[model samples]
Target: KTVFHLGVTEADLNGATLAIIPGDPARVQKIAELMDNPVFLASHREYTVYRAELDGQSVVVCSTGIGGPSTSIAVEELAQLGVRTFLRVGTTGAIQPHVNVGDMIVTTGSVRLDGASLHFAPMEFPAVPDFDVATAMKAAAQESGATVHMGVTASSDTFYPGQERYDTFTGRVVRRFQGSMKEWQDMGVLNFEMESATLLTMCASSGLKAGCVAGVIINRTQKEIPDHATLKETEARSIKVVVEAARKMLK
Candidate 1:
């Protein structure tokens, strides 16, 4: 059995319905800022929490730190706290070359590279998203005029050497992803991400709903996380696409 180590009582989280989790803490802050006058519910470790409304819909954003361990823990605890829906509004390294910068990817599923999800289920278990949430994200991206990469996101723990070393999570991630990218392109898996496996696997086990939408700012096929683009620009625009995609999901 898992536990909620944050010490947030049941009352503190009972009212929230949609939970937005971003890998970066500041991205969580940005999502909170997306809402009007978001109130600080709590902040501990990497979990910076806030709740607010957008277009009259209530939304909550929480930082899940990085890697699947932290993310899976957040999912387990948040589900226990009664958040029926979980949306990962974040950025990712695109597996294929066709995806352009500033475009969005609504991950129908993820290739689990991080070790945190193995505790939940075997890799053979398909990590699929809730249909409603996935559909809403695609519609929102289309309506918002964002080019969407609706496929599997190759989630990796290593941003640097993994792409280089065969043993590294990112390296094996890209290797394992090649076959799926071909198959997913044919079957339509969308783009890849780091956390959907954590979300989908956990949700299936716990009987909840989850989905992830990613901004394509980095291309893993290339040696660098991004093209010649400045790191700051890469960081800023990637998150911006995700934040916009998420706000639209609430509608």
Candidate 2:
């Protein structure tokens, strides 16, 4: 029988080891657009799987939707389907003042403020990206001439209080909550997002290669909306970087 959620079988994967996970189903075709001979595989729930060839290497572009719960499902089922390398190409909010919208962030490690990862490993476990993948992402970004920042990212479960944004309902902020941003900023936390904690921590437990490159879409501290033109530009650059890294992994 097909797997309960992802609706993919071993035969469907065709021996693909590298997977690029984006958080939006809308981005799935966008990722496929960046490759050659992209093939439609299966779309089940929040998981939309596709196959493409990059630099003559078979690559998987799987949509994970938002947050760690969905991402956990995607990674778990994909692992069962023979994926070994996971690269998250997604968007994030800048924590540091220097970073701007559309900037690239290659995460070296993440603060696991997520709950999904706890089900896989103890809270003491470190959420860190595969060094080789991070290195390749940095190199590819530099070659592509995109502004890149490399450091720790705080992966929170909620976009509002966790990142210290105002509650959408009341439209008021927490003093203690807003205070934590500077704490992380001074500690050199680069940005904020949802899934990389699970991506890194689960990969550590499963022994798979994992890394992330997020396009900065919002400046959390400055409360600024990012330029859409730059958002698209950075996302395209990020897709190329992940694809190039997939090629580099074969060498």
Candidate 3:
């Protein structure tokens, strides 16, 4: 029985309970290569999947594309295929001054700004990750000597006005979002990404485990994207942290 969006059957997962999800399909293979005996499973729509071994246990690596809608599909389908745990390893733009471009953030919870999550739970419901999974990721990240910040994230539905970026085609942010970035910064939200809220909310509501660790690509404060070398290094570190955390959980 293959899942619709991911095009993967239970056999394809091979009893894997843990899945590392990335927002970019291109990163799936790169992440899989870091594991032992990695095998390409399927690619359907924006979902690409790979199965790999970690600490003698099967682990799944799947991409959820860009935003919350696709991410919700990935989570739902993966859950149907028996993935009990999910870790989102993606990139984010920092909203705070001290968070540098190349740093990583371990998301503890998320502001439910994404529309997809609202379908799963009410607006008052909190979108928070599984405590054990988050703790493991935090420990692994700290042990790797990477600069890691742990905090709440704001998951937006769009990269532009939703995040208060006026550099899109319109070149104007709406009044509702004009000062939203500063408000989130004032509230101590670490970064802006697109999927964590949906992932965490769906997983928690379904009694599954979920967490996220993201590489900071751009510091919104300075609006400066990190250099290629810095981006590559930070992404590798983020993946490594997720991999180590999965190992810790499975072992």
Model 3 agreement with the true structure over 1-251: per-residue lDDT tens digits:
67777888999999998899988888999899999999999988889999999877999999999898999898888888888999888777888999987777999999988898989998888899999999999988888887889999999898889888877887998787888998999999999888888889988888999999887888867855568998888878888888988887885
RMSD to truth, every model = 4.5, 2.0, 1.3
Candidate that would win on lDDT? 3
Q: What is the C-alpha lDDT profile of model 2 across 155-228, one tens digit per residue?
A: 98988887877658877666646676778899999998999998899998888999998777878777656677
lDDT of 3: 0.89
lDDT for residue 145 in candidate 2, whole number 0-100: 77
- Listed in order, each prediction's TM-score against the native is 0.77, 0.93, 0.96
Writing each residue's lDDT as its tens digit, candidate 1 over 15-125 gives 666787887776676677766768777777887777766666666778888777788777777767767778777766665667776677887777676666678888787
Whole-structure CA lDDT of model 1: 0.67
Evaluated at residue 189, the lDDT of candidate 3 is: 94
lDDT of 3 at 125: 86
Candidate 3: residue pairs that collide: none
Q: Give candidate 1's error at residue 238 in angstroms.
A: 6.2
TM-score of 3: 0.96
